[PDB]
Amino acid sequence: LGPQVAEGENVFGVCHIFASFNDTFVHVTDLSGKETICRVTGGMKVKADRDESSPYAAMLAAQDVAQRCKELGITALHIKLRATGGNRTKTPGPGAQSALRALARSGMKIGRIEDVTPIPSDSTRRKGGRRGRRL
Amino acid sequence: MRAKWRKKRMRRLKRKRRKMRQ
Amino acid sequence: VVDPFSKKDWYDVKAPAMFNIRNIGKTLVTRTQGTKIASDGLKGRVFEVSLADLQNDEVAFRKFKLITEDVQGKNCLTNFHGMDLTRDKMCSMVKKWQTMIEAHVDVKTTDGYLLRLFCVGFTKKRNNQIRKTSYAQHQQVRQIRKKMMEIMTREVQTNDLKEVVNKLIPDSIGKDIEKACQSIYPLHDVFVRKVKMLKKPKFELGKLMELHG
Amino acid sequence: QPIKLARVTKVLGRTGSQGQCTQVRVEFMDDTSRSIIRNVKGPVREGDVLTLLESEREARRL
Amino acid sequence: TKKRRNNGRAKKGRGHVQPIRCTNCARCVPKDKAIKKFVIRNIVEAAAVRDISEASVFDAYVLPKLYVKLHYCVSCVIHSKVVRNRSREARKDRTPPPR
RNA sequence: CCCAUGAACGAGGAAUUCCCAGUAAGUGCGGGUCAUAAGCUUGCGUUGAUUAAGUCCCUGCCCUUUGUACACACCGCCCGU
RNA sequence: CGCAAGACGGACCAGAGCGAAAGCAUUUGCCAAGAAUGUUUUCAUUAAUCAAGAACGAAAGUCGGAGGUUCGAAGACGAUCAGAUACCGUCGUAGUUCCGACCAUAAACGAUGCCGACCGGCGAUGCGGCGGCGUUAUUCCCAUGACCCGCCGGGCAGCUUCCGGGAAACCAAAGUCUUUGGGUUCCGGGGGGAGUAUGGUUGCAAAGCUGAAACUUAAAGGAAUUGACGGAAGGGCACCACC
């Protein structure tokens, strides 16, 4: 419905960008993260799992998220970019930067940038073998 | 042949022989 | 046509008077319908606000988690719930030719607020040092950690939560620890790394309104 | 999408997969205080002018 | 015959070194034998920096960096060209490439 | 050599060959051809063209480093049933 | 936003430290050790290495008990493939964890026994001790910390060298070897058969220790060199390559 205060003064949300190497999540929530405004993923915008994590799918997802947030009256976004984490890779997938670029290109204000991938103080055993993946 | 697999074959042979001579 | 967000009302979230800036932002909750009151779905919400967005001239790498303890008149009154550093700062502070001394204390303020404070510090390379490394020996590390522990306990257990947060904002505890440890091994980046709510006293609306003014 | 001109000052090199781009430094006229690096397609020269459709975009350097 | 005096590791003065998992393949490699990279890269690319800085609600917000520690095994480090083969004389060289 | 019934032919399959300035090409002429003997080749002129002044990708050949249990040299050598 | 469980201690973390080796990394406390340094303390040969014998001994594995998060032999599927009983993927049992009892094996590696002496240089680094300009902290003095410059003693190492050695690779030890003798233990005798058969011994088992012969064979093998090759890397060239 939109907040009572107009868009000349910024209304902030938190865009969690989860960029795994298999797809990208662009998930805008309330500042507390409890309540969500719109969560669209790169897999909702392609018909092939190959491009589920492509930068193109992430940019489309970011565009749709930005338009949906603008229609509810959110002009600025706090970015919480995260990779798979745990034992797995700490580097965000290929779609993270494309999602951020398309989020900033769609008439949105960028607040603070933060990295929130889960880093263990030490972890359980990694999925691969002791010799690891051999392909 | 890898030496450890030759050792494994010899050990399986020894087990089969142990089954032979009870 | 069923839109959940036509059912949702937006509330302002306030910060306790310990901070220069009060309106931390807006939060939206579904309107009350029966026993599913909006206030209860709004209470107990944690907002991670950078200290730059809470004070006019303070560092941005220090974040404060504020928890909504009450809601009145479309206005959420938050209370101090914890403190933290951004991942970038902590990652930058850990270099490879020095030791990182880490200490922690479970300490209760004079108003029943039991916190857990984490302090982190790094040994400092001298300006005329030629040795590549600046390692402190194990006993030196233990002395530094004991000093950290005692200083944090002194700075927390003597005051109440308001003054504790007031000394957390400029992080006077970190500067005090850095001052005290130059007699053991000079320290480089001394910070209260993280504070977490371990135990709260019973909720009293009077003290919460006192904090909000 | 404004169009502006910048004078070539130093032809930096030739790049491309099979080689079709000339990476070159161009100094803007109207400022002369800012210069950028652009990879122009086709036979280019030294000291001439180039028509860019985007001033905020730069190609890879080195 | 011996290719390296240090056997391709830094296990001098101990008997066992704890292993780590390769960031690429998850292979178990001794921590002193694995090839360690510390990449401190801007969290936004040099392309997205212009749009992100233009759209920032702050002035001179300075974007945060990303500090990643990569522990390649020898096979993965060679395949990724992080290190490469060297001549028998040049193998002994231990100064990092100038970059 | 002359007379008429005369057939796909809107850029021609995946995929490819030869090409840098009097050049790709369209055309005639003397030969190996030959008893007049050319759809081939050769040599010759003849009217004659924009992308190209670059690079190491698809293709290869070379060089250096490197590995080798190959030296009949990877179409090598060799293991086991 | 919490709660529970089990596992593990990132970054700091190093050709750094400690331990007989295996091995050892969150804080704090307790417990018993330990090297090195310092010593104008004490004993006074009490020592070195060692058949027999004994302690410890990664991982896996075996018995019971507890637990059981992750990962995961076996296994079930899904792929790839000519075929895949594999590589890749989803699950997943034993196991992985702790306690007690076994097992005593690893490329358990420095592929290099221990003790002692002598033989070049250099810069580092860890611990202890000694000496000294100067800087910094404990508001100011000495002490002591952090630096700085040296020295000494043991230690993990590195570079360099026509010490010398070696088949060389290489090694300040793998040197002080036909100019051959400091002490002592273990152990090898062309390649296979074969660490096999057999006997003995140990173990609940799996297996551990000891351990042949017949027969067969002219070579196996080490280091280095030149080629050729590579589904190794890096460079260079060409319209019989490309753009």
Side-chain angles (χ1 to χ4, degrees), chain A residues 119-122 124-127 132-135:
Chain A
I119 275 72
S121 292
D122 255 2
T124 87
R125 216 197 150 76
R126 175 115 161 250
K127 159 133 79 72
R133 259 193 85 205
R134 287 178 304 284
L135 156 82

Side-chain angles (χ1 to χ4, degrees), chain C residues 68-85:
Chain C
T68 300
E69 291 257 313
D70 190 290
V71 47
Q72 333 195 351
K74 218 76 53 158
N75 224 317
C76 320
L77 311 171
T78 52
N79 192 4
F80 173 82
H81 190 56
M83 197 255 312
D84 229 313
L85 298 176

Side-chain angles (χ1 to χ4, degrees), chain E residues 53-71:
Chain E
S53 280
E54 175 204 8
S56 196
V57 290
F58 310 107
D59 285 323
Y61 163 68
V62 52
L63 305 318
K65 324 214 73 181
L66 196 58
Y67 301 77
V68 183
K69 320 117 199 194
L70 318 153
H71 302 160

Side-chain angles (χ1 to χ4, degrees), chain D:
Chain D
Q1 278 74 252
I3 302 167
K4 66 222 323 188
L5 309 190
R7 165 164 301 123
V8 160
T9 66
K10 200 168 191 165
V11 174
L12 308 158
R14 291 280 270 92
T15 76
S17 51
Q18 291 82 12
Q20 319 94 333
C21 320
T22 310
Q23 164 171 74
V24 64
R25 183 163 311 181
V26 289
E27 276 178 40
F28 294 89
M29 203 279 326
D30 51 338
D31 302 323
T32 316
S33 37
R34 55 157 323 159
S35 59
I36 63 169
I37 309 298
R38 298 207 36 92
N39 296 17
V40 31
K41 211 232 196 177
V44 85
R45 251 212 180 72
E46 179 40 85
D48 53 346
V49 102
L50 297 166
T51 74
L52 57 94
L53 285 84
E54 302 188 314
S55 188
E56 39 198 333
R57 177 176 45 82
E58 294 177 7
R60 282 170 193 197
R61 162 83 277 204
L62 283 186

Side-chain angles (χ1 to χ4, degrees), chain E residues 6-23:
Chain E
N6 66 346
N7 313 319
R9 47 183 320 165
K11 199 199 69 57
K12 295 279 188 25
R14 54 211 49 94
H16 189 245
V17 175
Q18 60 261 93
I20 54 190
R21 302 312 281 280
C22 181
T23 53

Side-chain angles (χ1 to χ4, degrees), chain E:
Chain E
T1 189
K2 277 197 73 172
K3 198 176 198 177
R4 290 171 201 81
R5 163 143 180 154
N6 66 346
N7 313 319
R9 47 183 320 165
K11 199 199 69 57
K12 295 279 188 25
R14 54 211 49 94
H16 189 245
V17 175
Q18 60 261 93
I20 54 190
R21 302 312 281 280
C22 181
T23 53
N24 217 56
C25 49
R27 174 167 229 274
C28 264
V29 48
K31 179 170 138 123
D32 69 354
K33 187 183 180 110
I35 288 83
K36 271 104 77 197
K37 281 230 145 263
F38 198 31
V39 40
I40 302 107
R41 43 193 263 251
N42 269 301
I43 217 158
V44 319
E45 42 187 7
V49 70
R50 221 253 174 270
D51 301 298
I52 264 64
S53 280
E54 175 204 8
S56 196
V57 290
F58 310 107
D59 285 323
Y61 163 68
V62 52
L63 305 318
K65 324 214 73 181
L66 196 58
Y67 301 77
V68 183
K69 320 117 199 194
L70 318 153
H71 302 160
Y72 308 95
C73 77
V74 173
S75 323
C76 274
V77 76
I78 289 175
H79 184 80
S80 295
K81 275 128 185 171
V82 180
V83 296
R84 74 185 38 51
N85 89 304
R86 303 197 284 183
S87 35
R88 162 172 264 197
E89 175 80 293
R91 282 203 255 269
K92 316 154 134 291
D93 195 359
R94 284 178 70 98
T95 173
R99 191 188 63 190

